[PDB]
A paper describes a structure:
Muscle-specific RING fingers proteins (MuRFs) are E3 ubiquitin ligases that associate with the sarcomeric cytoskeleton reportedly through their CC domains. MuRFs form the C-II TRIM class, whose C-terminal specific fraction contains a COS (C-terminal subgroup One Signature)-box motif and an intrinsically disordered acidic tail. MuRF1 targets components of the contractile sarcoskeleton; namely, myosin, troponin-T and titin. Despite their functional diversity, TRIM proteins invariably share a tripartite fold consisting of a RING finger (R), one or two RING finger-like B-box domains (B) and a helical segment predicted to form a coiled-coil (CC) motif.
To gain an insight into the assembly of the CC-prone segment identified, we elucidated the crystal structure of the corresponding fragment from human MuRF1 (MuRF1CC) to 2.1 Å resolution. The crystals contained four copies of the MuRF1CC chain in their asymmetric unit. These assembled into two parallel dimers, each having an ‘open scissor’ conformation that intercalated through their C-terminal ends to form a palindromic, inverted tetramer. In MuRF1, however, the chains within each dimer are out of registry by one full heptad-repeat and their crossing angle is broad, leading to the unpairing of both N- and C-termini. The resulting exposure of hydrophobic residues at the C-terminus permits the formation of an interchain hydrophobic core that supports the assembly of the inverted tetramer. Other than that core, the contacts within each dimer are few, with only two salt bridges (K224-E236’ and E236-K238’) providing chain recognition (analysis of chain interfaces used PISA). One additional salt bridge (K238-D268’’; chains DA in figure 3a) is present in the structure, but it contributes to tetramer stabilization. The analysis revealed that MuRF1CC can establish manifold interactions, being able to support concurrently the formation of parallel and antiparallel dimers and tetrameric helical bundles. In the MuRF1CC tetramer, helices arrange themselves along the same interfaces as those occupied by the COS-box α-hairpin in the ab initio models.
Numbering used by the authors:
A (entry chain A): -3 to -1, 214 to 270
B (entry chain C): -2 to -1, 214 to 268
C (entry chain D): 214 to 266
D (entry chain B): -3 to -1, 214 to 268
Amino acid sequence: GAMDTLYAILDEKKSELLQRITQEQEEKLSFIEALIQQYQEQLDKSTKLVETAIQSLDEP
Amino acid sequence: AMDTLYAILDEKKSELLQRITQEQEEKLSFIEALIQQYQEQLDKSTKLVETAIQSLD
Amino acid sequence: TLYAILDEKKSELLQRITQEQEEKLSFIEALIQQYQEQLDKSTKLVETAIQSL
Amino acid sequence: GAMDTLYAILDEKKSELLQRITQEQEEKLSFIEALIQQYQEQLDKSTKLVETAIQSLD
């Protein structure tokens, strides 16, 4: 009947919505991971610069 | 009747869509837990760095 | 009077070592300030970026 | 020799002035060294903190 069709459609819509939300969340996750990596690298570079400058100051 | 036949078919289609929806929910649940964990790690890190910054003042 | 001579030299030596160490302190202070500024910039950037999500 | 004496007194005086100047130089220099050492220690504590932040992001 028409009511069975309607519910099947709503279930399909539910799966499609989950799919859309998932893709957007996956994008969110990737951006977060690329952000953490860049931050980490910035923090690492700066600290290595600093520890090298001090180590070399008290020397050469 | 095409009714009883189409009914059994619809049951199996429905089961398959349920299986797919279940898997989708699992995967989305995992992505979201990961996003929260990374955000918390990022938060802790910025706090540690701000402590570092202030300790140089 | 000989110790006056030796104390003049010591004073001149103290003066040069002092300028060298002042320079050292100057470099350290600037290095530290530079570190702080970079740490801070990186941190503000990441938080801003997070906020834009 | 009135002029000799004046020089002698002045001779004593410069030595005394010198000893005060030297003592002050050492006090300034020692202070500068403490300040350097203090800063180097803060910077070390600071870098380990950033290292812990970096390790957190793993």
